[PDB]
Coordinates of C-alpha atoms and ligand atoms in Angstrom, one line a residue:
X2 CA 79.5 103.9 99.1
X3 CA 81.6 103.3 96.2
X4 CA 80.0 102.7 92.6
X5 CA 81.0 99.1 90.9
X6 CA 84.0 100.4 88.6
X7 CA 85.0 102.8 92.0
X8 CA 84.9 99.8 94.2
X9 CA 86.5 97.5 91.8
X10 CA 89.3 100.1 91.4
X11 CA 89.8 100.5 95.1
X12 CA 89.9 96.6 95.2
X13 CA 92.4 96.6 92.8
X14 CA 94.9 98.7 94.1
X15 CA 94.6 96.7 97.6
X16 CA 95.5 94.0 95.1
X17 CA 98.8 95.9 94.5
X18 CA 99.3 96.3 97.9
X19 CA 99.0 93.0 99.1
X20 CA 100.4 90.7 95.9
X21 CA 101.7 93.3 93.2
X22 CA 98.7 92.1 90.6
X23 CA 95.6 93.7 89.6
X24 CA 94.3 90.6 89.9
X25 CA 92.4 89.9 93.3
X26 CA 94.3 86.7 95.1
X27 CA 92.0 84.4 96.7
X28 CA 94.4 81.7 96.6
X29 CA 97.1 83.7 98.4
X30 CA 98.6 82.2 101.4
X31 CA 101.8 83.7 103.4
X32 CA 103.5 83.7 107.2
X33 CA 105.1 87.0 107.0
X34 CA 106.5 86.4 111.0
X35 CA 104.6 89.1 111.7
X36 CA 102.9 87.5 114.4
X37 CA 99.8 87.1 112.8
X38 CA 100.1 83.4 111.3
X39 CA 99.5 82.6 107.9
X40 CA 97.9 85.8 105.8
X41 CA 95.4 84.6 103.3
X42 CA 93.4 85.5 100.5
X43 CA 91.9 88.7 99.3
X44 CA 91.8 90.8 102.2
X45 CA 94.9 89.0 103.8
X46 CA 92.8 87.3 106.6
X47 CA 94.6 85.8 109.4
X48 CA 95.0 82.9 111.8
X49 CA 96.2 84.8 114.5
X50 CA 93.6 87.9 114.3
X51 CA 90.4 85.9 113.9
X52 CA 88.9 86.6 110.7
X53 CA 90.7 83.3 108.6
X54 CA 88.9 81.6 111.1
X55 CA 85.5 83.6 110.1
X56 CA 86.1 82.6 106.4
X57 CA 86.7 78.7 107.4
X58 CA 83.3 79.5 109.3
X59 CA 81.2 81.0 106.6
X60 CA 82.3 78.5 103.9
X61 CA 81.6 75.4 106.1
X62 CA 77.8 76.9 106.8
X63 CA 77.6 76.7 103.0
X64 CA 79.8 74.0 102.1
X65 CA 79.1 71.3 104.8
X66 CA 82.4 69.0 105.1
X67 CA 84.7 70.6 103.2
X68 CA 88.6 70.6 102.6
X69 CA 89.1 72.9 105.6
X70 CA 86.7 72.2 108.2
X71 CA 89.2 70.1 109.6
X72 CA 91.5 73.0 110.9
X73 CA 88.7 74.6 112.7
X74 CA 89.4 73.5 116.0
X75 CA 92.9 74.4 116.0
X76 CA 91.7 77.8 113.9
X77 CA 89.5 78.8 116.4
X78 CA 92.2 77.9 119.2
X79 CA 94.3 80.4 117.5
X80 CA 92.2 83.1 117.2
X81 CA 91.4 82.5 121.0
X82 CA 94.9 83.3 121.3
X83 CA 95.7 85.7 119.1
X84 CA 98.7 83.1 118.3
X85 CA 101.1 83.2 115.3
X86 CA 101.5 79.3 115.5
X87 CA 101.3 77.7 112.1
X88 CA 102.8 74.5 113.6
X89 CA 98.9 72.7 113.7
X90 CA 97.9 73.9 109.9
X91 CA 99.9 71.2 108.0
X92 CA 98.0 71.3 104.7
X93 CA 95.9 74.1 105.1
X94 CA 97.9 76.5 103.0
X95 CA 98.1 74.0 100.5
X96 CA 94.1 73.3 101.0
X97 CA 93.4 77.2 100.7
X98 CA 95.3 77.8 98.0
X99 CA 93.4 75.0 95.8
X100 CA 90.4 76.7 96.4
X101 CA 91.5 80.0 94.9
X102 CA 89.4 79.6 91.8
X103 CA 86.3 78.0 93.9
X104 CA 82.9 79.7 93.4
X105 CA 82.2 78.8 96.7
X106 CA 85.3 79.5 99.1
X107 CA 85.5 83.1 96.6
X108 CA 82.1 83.7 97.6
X109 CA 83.0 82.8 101.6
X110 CA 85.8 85.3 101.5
X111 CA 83.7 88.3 99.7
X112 CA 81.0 87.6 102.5
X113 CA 83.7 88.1 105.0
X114 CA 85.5 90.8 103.4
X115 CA 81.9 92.5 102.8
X116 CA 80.8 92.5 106.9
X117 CA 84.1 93.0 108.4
X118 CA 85.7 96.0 106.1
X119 CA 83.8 96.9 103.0
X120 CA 80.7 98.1 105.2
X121 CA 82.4 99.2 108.4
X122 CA 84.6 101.5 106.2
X123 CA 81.8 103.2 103.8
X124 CA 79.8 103.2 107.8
X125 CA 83.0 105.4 109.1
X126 CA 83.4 107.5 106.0
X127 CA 80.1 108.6 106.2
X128 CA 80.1 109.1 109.9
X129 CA 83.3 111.4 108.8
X130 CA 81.1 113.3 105.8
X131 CA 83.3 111.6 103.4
X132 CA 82.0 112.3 99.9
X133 CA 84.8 111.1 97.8
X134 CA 85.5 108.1 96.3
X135 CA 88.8 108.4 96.5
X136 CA 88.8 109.1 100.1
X137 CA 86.3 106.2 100.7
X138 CA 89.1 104.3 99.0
X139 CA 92.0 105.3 100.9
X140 CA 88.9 103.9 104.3
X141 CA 88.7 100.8 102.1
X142 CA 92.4 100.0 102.0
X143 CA 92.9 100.8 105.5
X144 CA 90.8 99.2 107.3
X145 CA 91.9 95.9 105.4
X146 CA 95.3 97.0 106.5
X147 CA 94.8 97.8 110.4
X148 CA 91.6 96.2 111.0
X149 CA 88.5 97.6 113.0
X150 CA 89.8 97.1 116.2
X151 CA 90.1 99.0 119.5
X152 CA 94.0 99.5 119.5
X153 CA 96.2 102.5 118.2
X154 CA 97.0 101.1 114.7
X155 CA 93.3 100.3 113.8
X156 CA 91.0 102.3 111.4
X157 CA 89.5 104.7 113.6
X158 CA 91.9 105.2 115.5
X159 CA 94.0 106.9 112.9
X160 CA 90.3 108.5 111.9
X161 CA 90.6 109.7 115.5
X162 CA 94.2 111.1 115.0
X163 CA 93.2 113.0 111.7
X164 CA 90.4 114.4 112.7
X165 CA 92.5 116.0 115.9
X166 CA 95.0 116.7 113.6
X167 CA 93.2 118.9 111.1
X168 CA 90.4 120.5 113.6
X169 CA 87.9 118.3 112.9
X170 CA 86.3 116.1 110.0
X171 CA 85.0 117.0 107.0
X172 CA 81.5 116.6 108.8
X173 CA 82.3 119.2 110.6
X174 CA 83.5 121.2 107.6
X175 CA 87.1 120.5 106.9
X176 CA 88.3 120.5 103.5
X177 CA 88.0 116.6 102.5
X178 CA 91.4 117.2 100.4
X179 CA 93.0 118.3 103.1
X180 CA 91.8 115.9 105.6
X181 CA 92.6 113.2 103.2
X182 CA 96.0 114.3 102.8
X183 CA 96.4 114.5 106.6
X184 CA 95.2 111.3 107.4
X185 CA 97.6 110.2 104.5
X186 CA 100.0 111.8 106.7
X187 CA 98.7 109.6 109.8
X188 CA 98.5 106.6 107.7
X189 CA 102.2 106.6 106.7
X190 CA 103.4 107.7 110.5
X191 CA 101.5 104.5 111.6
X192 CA 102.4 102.0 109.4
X193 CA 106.6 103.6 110.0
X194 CA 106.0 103.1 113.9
X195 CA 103.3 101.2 114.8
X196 CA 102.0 100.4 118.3
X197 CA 102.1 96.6 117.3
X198 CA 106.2 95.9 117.2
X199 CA 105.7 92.7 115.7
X200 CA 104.1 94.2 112.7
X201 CA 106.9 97.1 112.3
X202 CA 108.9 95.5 110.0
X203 CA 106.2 94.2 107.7
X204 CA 104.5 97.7 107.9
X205 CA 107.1 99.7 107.2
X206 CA 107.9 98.1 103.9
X207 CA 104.1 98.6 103.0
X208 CA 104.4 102.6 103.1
X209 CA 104.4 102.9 99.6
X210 CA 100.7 102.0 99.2
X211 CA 99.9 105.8 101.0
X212 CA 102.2 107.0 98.2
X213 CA 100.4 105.3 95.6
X214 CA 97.0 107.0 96.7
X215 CA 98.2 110.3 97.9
X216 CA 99.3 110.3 93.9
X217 CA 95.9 109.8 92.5
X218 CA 95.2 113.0 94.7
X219 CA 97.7 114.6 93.3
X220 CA 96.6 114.0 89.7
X221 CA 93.0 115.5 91.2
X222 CA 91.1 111.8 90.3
X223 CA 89.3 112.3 93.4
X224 CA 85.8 110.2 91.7
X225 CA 88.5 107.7 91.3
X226 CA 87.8 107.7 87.5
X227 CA 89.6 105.4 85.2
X228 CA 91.9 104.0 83.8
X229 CA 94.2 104.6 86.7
X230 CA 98.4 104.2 86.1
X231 CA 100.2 103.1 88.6
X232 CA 103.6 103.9 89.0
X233 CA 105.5 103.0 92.3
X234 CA 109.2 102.6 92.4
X235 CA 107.9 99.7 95.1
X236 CA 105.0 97.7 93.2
X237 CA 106.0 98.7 89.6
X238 CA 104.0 100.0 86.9
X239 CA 100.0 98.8 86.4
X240 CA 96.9 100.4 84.8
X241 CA 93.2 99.7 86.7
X242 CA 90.3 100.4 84.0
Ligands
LIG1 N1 107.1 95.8 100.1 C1 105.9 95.3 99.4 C2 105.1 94.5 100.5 O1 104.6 95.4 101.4 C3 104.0 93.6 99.9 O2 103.6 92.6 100.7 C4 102.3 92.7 101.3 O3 102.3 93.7 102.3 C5 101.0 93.9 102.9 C6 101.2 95.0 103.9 O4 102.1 94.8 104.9 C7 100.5 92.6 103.6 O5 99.3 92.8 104.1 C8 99.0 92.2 105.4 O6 97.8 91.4 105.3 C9 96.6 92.0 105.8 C10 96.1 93.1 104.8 O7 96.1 92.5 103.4 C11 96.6 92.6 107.2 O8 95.9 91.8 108.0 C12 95.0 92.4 108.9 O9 95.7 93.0 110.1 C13 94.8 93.7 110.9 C14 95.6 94.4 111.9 O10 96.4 93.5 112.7 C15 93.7 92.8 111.5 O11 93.0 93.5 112.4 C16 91.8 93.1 113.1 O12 90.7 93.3 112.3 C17 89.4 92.8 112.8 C18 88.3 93.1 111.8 O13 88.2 94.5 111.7 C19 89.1 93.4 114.2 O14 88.0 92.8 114.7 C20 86.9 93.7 115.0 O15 87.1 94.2 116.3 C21 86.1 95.2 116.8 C22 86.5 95.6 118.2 O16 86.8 94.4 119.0 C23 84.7 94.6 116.7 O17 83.8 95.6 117.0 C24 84.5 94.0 115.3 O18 83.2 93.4 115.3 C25 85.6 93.1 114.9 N2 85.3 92.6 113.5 C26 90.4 93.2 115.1 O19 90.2 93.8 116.3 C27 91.6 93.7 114.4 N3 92.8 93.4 115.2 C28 93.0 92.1 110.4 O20 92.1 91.0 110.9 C29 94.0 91.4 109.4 N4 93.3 90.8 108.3 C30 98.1 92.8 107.6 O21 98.1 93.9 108.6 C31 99.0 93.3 106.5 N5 100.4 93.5 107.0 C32 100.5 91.5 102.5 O22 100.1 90.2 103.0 C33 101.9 91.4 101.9 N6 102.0 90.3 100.9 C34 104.4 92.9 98.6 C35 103.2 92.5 97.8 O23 103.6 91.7 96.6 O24 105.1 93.8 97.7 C36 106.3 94.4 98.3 O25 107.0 95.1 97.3

């Protein structure tokens, strides 16, 4: 997978992408009417698309009783549905949001973010013969961004579409630069038209995030080495250590 300063940087610039800090944002809480609900915390979980629901899960099995465990029902009704109603979570974003600096809820949201992206992305880049970190990197960020799922905007799907794209994965011998750059390429395409309308708008002001990493290509940081600078006419100017 990725080393602790490699992962940490990866983490970082999804931080970017998601807030425009370093800075990881537990607390975070947003409806972007992009028909996922309220988009929460570090890896932007959701109430429509079932995994806020799995954080409100894990931290009640720890933390018996707590602030939020009163919103599962309606959570779990959500996630059901896949619904972007926010109309039944009076006070939750509030309640989430006081627990941004909780050892506890942190630790629920790392446990989620852990099963449902960090591991199935380092699982998929290997299965792809990824040996970069910067390439498991670009996985990381994008399978935070489009999910696991079975549908035409998810992870391997647009694994799928590279692969057809440049003859293959680097498995199978492709250049791992060049595949990278392709499913950069894919990536961007995606995110510009999804399959999903009701995350098009939303997605298409995300684009510069594939900028942001096919630059560190560019600057040939391919062990994701540090410090990284940042500089995105979207996000601004940072530096990662
Ligand atoms: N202009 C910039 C702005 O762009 C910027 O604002 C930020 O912009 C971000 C990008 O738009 C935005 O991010 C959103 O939030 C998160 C990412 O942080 C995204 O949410 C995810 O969306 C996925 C796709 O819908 C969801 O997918 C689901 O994933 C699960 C888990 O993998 C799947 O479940 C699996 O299913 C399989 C098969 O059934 C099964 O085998 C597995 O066991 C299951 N685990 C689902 O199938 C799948 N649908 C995902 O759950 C969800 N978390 C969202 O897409 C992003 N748009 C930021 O929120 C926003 N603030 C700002 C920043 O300051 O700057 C401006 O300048």
């Amino acid at each position: 997978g990725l080393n602790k300063d490699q992962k940490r940087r990866a983490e970082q610039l999804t931080s970017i992408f998601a807030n425009g800090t370093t800075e990881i944002q537990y607390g975070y809480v947003e409806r972007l009417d992009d028909g996922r609900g309220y988009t929460c915390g570090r890896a932007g979980f959701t109430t429509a698309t079932g995994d806020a629901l799995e954080v409100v899960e894990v931290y009640t099995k720890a933390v018996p009783n707590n602030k939020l465990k009163k919103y599962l029902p309606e959570l779990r009704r959500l996630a059901k549905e896949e619904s972007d109603d926010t109309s039944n979570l009076k006070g939750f974003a509030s309640a989430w949001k006081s627990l941004a600096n909780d050892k506890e809820f942190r630790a629920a949201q790392d446990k989620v973010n852990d099963h449902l992206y960090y591991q199935p992305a380092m699982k998929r880049s290997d299965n792809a013969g990824l040996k970069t970190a910067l390439a498991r990197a670009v996985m990381y960020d994008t399978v935070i961004q489009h999910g696991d799922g079975d549908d035409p905007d998810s992870f391997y799907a647009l694994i799928k579409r590279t692969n057809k794209k440049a003859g293959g994965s680097p498995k199978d011998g492709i250049d791992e630069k060049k595949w990278l750059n392709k499913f950069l390429d894919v990536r961007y395409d995606d995110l510009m038209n999804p399959a999903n309308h009701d995350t098009r708008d939303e997605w298409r002001e995300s684009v510069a995030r594939v900028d942001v990493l096919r630059s560190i290509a560019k600057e040939n940081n391919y062990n994701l080495n540090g410090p990284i600078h940042v500089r995105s006419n979207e996000y601004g100017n940072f530096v990662i250590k």
